[PDB]
Design a protein around this ligand. Sequence first.
Ligand SMILES: Cc1cc2nc3c(=O)[nH]c(=O)nc-3n(C[C@H](O)[C@H](O)[C@H](O)COP(=O)(O)O)c2cc1C
Ligand SMILES: Cc1cc([C@@H](C)NC(=O)c2[nH]cc(Cc3ccc(C(F)(F)F)cc3)c2C)no1
Ligand SMILES: O=C(O)c1cc(=O)[nH]c(=O)[nH]1
Length: 374
Amino acid sequence: NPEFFLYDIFLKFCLKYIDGEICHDLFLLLGKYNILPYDTSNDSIYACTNIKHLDFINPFGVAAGFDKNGVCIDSILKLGFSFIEIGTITPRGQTGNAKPRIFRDVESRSIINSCGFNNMGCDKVTENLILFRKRQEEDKLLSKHIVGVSIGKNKDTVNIVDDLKYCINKIGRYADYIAINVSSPNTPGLRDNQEAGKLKNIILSVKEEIDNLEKNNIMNDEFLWFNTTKKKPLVFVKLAPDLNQEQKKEIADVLLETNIDGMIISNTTTQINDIKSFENKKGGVSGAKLKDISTKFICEMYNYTNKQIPIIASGGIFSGLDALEKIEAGASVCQLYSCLVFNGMKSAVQIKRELNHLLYQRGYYNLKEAIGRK
Ligand SMILES: Cc1cc2nc3c(=O)[nH]c(=O)nc-3n(C[C@H](O)[C@H](O)[C@H](O)COP(=O)(O)O)c2cc1C
Ligand SMILES: Cc1cc([C@@H](C)NC(=O)c2[nH]cc(Cc3ccc(C(F)(F)F)cc3)c2C)no1
Ligand SMILES: O=C(O)c1cc(=O)[nH]c(=O)[nH]1
């Protein structure tokens, strides 16, 4: 804990004096050289959870966009997170929009971004994940930690599906699950793929390409799936909150039609117009202000899918209570982003015990029961 205390000092100075992207890069540099603190505590057995046959030692991971290139997986997980979603990645590396592209508002614990899927591309990120998977076998703090991969398209690409299949064939073996990103607001025209007709086509094509890796392989499953599950990656789809309610219904049954393994709710939003310092800026907003809207989006989709599609929660989770709200709404695991930005190295340590203490007070035996009790 003395270690976490020092990094909070650096955090505060960063938020006030340094550009956000520069801080974010320092974060990842510290992680790349393994000088962040560790959370070596046994996670409460009553707080574990699962998405279908995917097991999470605890209900908290890091959302996509934090480690877009998988250069910092070890150290983020060792902060106390049960999993991480890297990406979103694209087939080829791209620069994204021009800096400064991210702006934070400490006062409201909110953020606005317009990066534009900047990443090194899938060939490079794949070799980064392979190395992690090698280290994972050597490190007892990394065993049973889940790594998912968010996948998208390039600014230039016309065929959304052409980009996804390439990513899968390249990096599918090493992923525990795949997250289809059709919810980013800062790449023009991507959300249009969320319309049921286009989406169903995308899911089915994704699910297909995963199986073809399994089908044609001379070696056993033990050597094909170089991941944590030793099984083929699940398939999740991350959705945006800026949809009218009828659009949500058409998506729901498509998920049911395709037997999607899970749904991530939600992505950043553009509906927010209250925050002063973002009035000048463009892009998708995340943080506290996104909390209430994310929670509702969960209960609706949980409704439209008749509770048959596992939910991953995202958007405005800072507290152990914020988490229980997302779980009660029907979510099984929670993803964090803004919290890490405003709370720092201690984010996972703190939110885990808060939820633990809260589950006991509310009289829940374990976390699984609290799911969807609203
Ligand atoms: C700077 C930044 C980059 C992001 N990049 C991605 C991304 O590449 N893929 C994705 O699905 N979501 C991305 N997101 C959205 C977050 O992953 C998360 O879904 C959203 O920020 C809500 O979480 P929060 O309220 O805890 O911050 C990004 C968000 C931010 C602020
Ligand atoms: C992409 C993208 C995201 C961003 C913005 C939104 N991220 C951040 O502001 C951010 N991330 C992680 C932290 C915690 C942190 C803690 C300590 C230190 C150190 F090193 F100083 F001790 C640096 C950072 C912050 C403040 N900019 O680009
Ligand atoms: O990479 C990005 O710019 C991005 C993607 C996304 O899904 N959401 C977001 O806010 N930014």
